[PDB]
Amino acid sequence: AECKGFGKSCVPGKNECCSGYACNSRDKWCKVLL
């Protein structure tokens, strides 16, 4: 088991995204935190 990278589809509210990223519920994906 490992985190999710950039451009991957994830669910908002869970803890799948890697460090520095953020599960954007907008498109249900990961993105580099501001």
Side-chain angles (χ1 to χ4, degrees), residues 17-32:
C17 282
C18 227
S19 210
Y21 296 132
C23 213
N24 210 1
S25 190
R26 191 83 161 71
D27 214 47
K28 281 144 181 83
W29 73 312
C30 284
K31 53 154 271 90
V32 180

